[PDB]
From a paper:
Finally, it is important to note that two CCD residues, FtsBE56 and FtsBD59, are buried in the FtsB-FtsQ interface, especially for the interaction hot-spot FtsBE56 which has an accessible surface area (ASA) of only 3.8 Å², about 2% in ASA ratio. We found that the mutations of FtsBE56A or FtsBD59H did not affect the complex formation on SEC or the overall structure (RMSD ~ 0.45 Å from the wild type), and a mechanistic explanation is lacking for their apparent function in promoting cell constriction. Crystal structures of FtsBE56ALQ and FtsBD59HLQ mutant complexes were solved, revealing a displacement of the FtsB α2-α3 linker for ~2–4 Å. While the overall structures remained almost the same probably due to the stabilization of crystal packing, the coiled coil might be more prone to move and this tendency could be transferred to their C-terminal linkers. When no such external force existed in solution, we observed a dramatic reduction of the higher-order oligomer band on native PAGE of the FtsBE56A and FtsBD59H mutants, indicating that the inter-oligomer contact may be affected by a potential allosteric change. Herein, unless the FtsBLQ complex adopts a different conformation in vivo which exposes FtsBE56 and FtsBD59 for direct interactions with PBP1b or FtsWI, the only other possibility for these residues to affect cell division should lie in the FtsB-FtsQ interface, which connects the coiled coil to FtsQ. Mutations that disrupt this connection may detach the coiled coil from FtsQ, and the coiled coil may move accordingly to fit the short TM domains of FtsBL in a less tilted orientation in the membrane. Although no conclusion could yet be made, the CCD residues, FtsBE56 and FtsBD59, are likely to function as a negative regulatory element to allosterically prevent any undesired movement in the balanced interplay between FtsBLQ and the PG synthases. Mutations of FtsBE56 and FtsBD59, on the other hand, may induce a conformational change of the coiled coil to further enhance the activation of FtsWI, impair the inhibition of PBP1b and promote constriction.
The essential membrane protein complex of FtsB, FtsL and FtsQ (FtsBLQ) is at the heart of the divisome assembly cascade in Escherichia coli. This complex regulates the transglycosylation and transpeptidation activities of the FtsW-FtsI complex and PBP1b via coordination with FtsN, the trigger for the onset of constriction. A core complex at the heart of this machinery is composed of three type-II bitopic membrane proteins, the Filamentous temperature-sensitive proteins B, L and Q (FtsB, FtsL, FtsQ). For a long time, the FtsBLQ complex was believed to act as a non-enzymatic scaffold for the assembly of the divisome, but recent studies revealed it to be a positive regulator of the FtsWI complex and a negative regulator of the bi-functional PG synthase PBP1b.
Residue numbers in the entry:
A (entry chain B): 1 to 89
B (entry chain L): 39 to 119
C (entry chain Q): 22 to 260
Amino acid sequence: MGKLTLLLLAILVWLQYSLWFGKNGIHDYTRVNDDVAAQQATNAKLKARNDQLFAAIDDLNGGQEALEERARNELSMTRPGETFYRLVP
Amino acid sequence: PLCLFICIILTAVTVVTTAHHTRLLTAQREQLVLERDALDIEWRNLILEENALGDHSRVERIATEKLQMQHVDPSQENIVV
Amino acid sequence: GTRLAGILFLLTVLTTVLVSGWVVLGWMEDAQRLPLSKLVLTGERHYTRNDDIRQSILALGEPGTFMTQDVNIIQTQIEQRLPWIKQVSVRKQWPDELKIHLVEYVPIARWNDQHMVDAEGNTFSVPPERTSKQVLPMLYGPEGSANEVLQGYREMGQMLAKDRFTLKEAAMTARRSWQLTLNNDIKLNLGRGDTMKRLARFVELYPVLQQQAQTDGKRISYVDLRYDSGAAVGWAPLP
């Protein structure tokens, strides 16, 4: 024992200190991991929001399935022969 | 004893392992930041093209082209809850 | 004297061990070099057969013995041969023991056409002959949205079947529009707006909608519902 083993002991603790509080240690890993985890979750929603709107816009050009929904909903106009009903409270 | 020396080998391996992974996540978080900005800019371009297409002046003129008829109140059946 | 009897008793017991230890060894040594053939398919199998596993395991090539056949390669091969299997566990035990356990997906709806979808949202495929015997709803939607349509179908179905309606088909587009199909070819054309509130309206409008169906003798072709507090109902001549 003496210093033949203690000199090699405190260095391990300095590595345990520098493992958690290092420049890229455990704390920075956990800190960055949470930042990456939350950010990519948002980009999933943002992409899902854009992809849905991109699909909507991709329909109004050369297609009439989505344009007919805009004409029905916002202009209240129907096709010839369809008996239009309405609900009043 | 000499077991501590071996633990230092493992700890240094863990340090290099942890540092290598954090250096990769930092390179990815720096990429997710750029990914969001390109989405919102793409999102802004989309909402403008929707207005250019979801324009009632151009939606109604194509609706009447597709044999549509504006809402008439006579031919409109009503129901109470 | 005692050591003579002892050493002889020692070497007599020593002899019978080496003889038995060699005869029994010949049983396990010559039986470790044979391709294991028999299997026991444990688990709840409804879509797979016994010959399905036998054909898929010898399709790799050589039969393979104990200490020469990887169990991970078998469970891997079986997984790519049968898409309706959730998890495979191929385990061998001594000679001729092919303990292959199986777990199948349970189709509760037919995603698109060629595929099914279980209650947990996972996607898989089953040949048409092994599932045409069961009737289940037809779910449609863009790729990857297999679970998204399921939540809509069940929420819409719970409200719809609450009033003795049968939701046979539920179609969704990439732009998140909807198009339901009811019994007797009653096509519902919904839109990207509030769907569970438009659906709750058609439930209330249905008495008057059918009331005018036989008033002039016309089956309900479709009910276009993408209006605000309104619905444009089509008509079809009954056969």
